[PDB]
């Protein structure tokens, strides 16, 4: 197209190996990071225990309900409880899940990411669904319990990003590499006898022209073409963790212009 191109190598529902080409390392990383920590998601953030007899103590469980990824497709149309005006929270700012388990079976009763029950009105929008990729469709084993062990909670998922806390992260890992044949000499391989012998060459050594002695040191050498790979957790589709990444990082850069503006007036 126009500026920094892409060229998706493999790709799936849980990963997007692609080649970011014709960009500044800076920008590549910036995006790298944005993905990792500032993309809005949705997660349980408040847990009201009414009853619990499990062996796991209250907060122990709570903590977990946080990492249980939830649906965050339209998270971009839900509000940050903090910016909404409802004293505390509302359907306009949050989702309300529920959990109730009782050991009936004479055999260990299992509580899963599935047993969560949305109670608030989703005013029609994909959000708040305990994301399941589990093969049997149960996902994330919240906790087990014996004979008559009960457990009644209530959850309140809200917006929120990674900086605020991890559970709101959506990325989880992100392969990043460039210049597979150390050509700009950005590293200084350690060795005993041979650099090449001891140090494994990467999958990406291919997609780039090997060194070849003779030639002098390319010092004018810049650095474009980055072999990335944005995995995903679910909360948002692999593709998203990259587009919304590219976006947020953009709005961020935006606000800086906007700020510079109000600045003028006064």
């Amino acid at each position: 197209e126009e500026g920094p191109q892409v060229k998706i190598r493999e790709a799936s529902k849980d990963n997007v190996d692609f080649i970011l080409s014709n960009v500044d390392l800076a920008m590549a990383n910036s995006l790298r990071r944005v993905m990792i920590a500032e993309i809005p998601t949705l997660a349980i953030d408040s847990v009201e225990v009414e009853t619990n007899t499990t062996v796991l103590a209250d907060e122990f469980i709570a903590h977990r309900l946080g990492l249980i990824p939830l649906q965050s497709m339209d998270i971009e149309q839900l509000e940050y409880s903090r910016d909404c005006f409802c004293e505390d929270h509302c359907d306009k700012c949050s989702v309300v899940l529920t959990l109730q388990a009782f050991g009936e079976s004479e055999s260990t009763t299992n509580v899963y990411s599935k047993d969560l029950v949305i109670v608030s009105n989703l005013m029609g929008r994909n959000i708040g669904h305990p994301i399941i990729q589990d093969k049997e469709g149960n996902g994330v084993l919240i906790c087990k319990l014996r004979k008559g062990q009960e457990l009644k909670l209530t959850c309140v998922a809200k917006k929120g990003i990674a900086k605020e806390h991890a559970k709101w992260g959506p990325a989880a890992a992100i392969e990043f590499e460039y210049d597979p044949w150390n050509k700009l000499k950005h590293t200084d391989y350690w060795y005993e006898q041979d650099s090449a012998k001891e140090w494994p060459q990467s999958k990406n050594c291919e997609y780039e022209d090997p060194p070849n002695e003779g030639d002098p040191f390319d010092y004018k050498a810049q650095a474009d073409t980055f072999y990335m790979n944005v995995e995903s957790v679910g909360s948002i589709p692999v593709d998203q963790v990259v587009v919304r990444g590219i976006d947020t990082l953009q709005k961020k850069v935006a606000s800086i212009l906007l700020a510079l503006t109000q600045m003028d007036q006064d």
Binding site: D45, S46, E48, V49, D58, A62, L65, G148, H165
Partner: protein, 46 residues
């Protein structure tokens, strides 16, 4: 509807007041736990 104490072994919602003995209505096991609060407790989720 409502309770107060319990039995460590023979888990059974018991309860009594001053000088009503500190045993269970079944198992002597002079233990007795105090069962949760009706008050709902809340937790930060991180």
């Amino acid at each position: 509807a409502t309770l107060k104490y319990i039995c460590a072994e023979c888990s059974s919602k018991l309860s009594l007041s001053r000088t009503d003995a500190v045993r269970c209505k079944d198992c002597g096991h002079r233990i007795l736990l105090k069962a949760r609060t009706k008050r709902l407790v809340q937790f930060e989720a991180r």
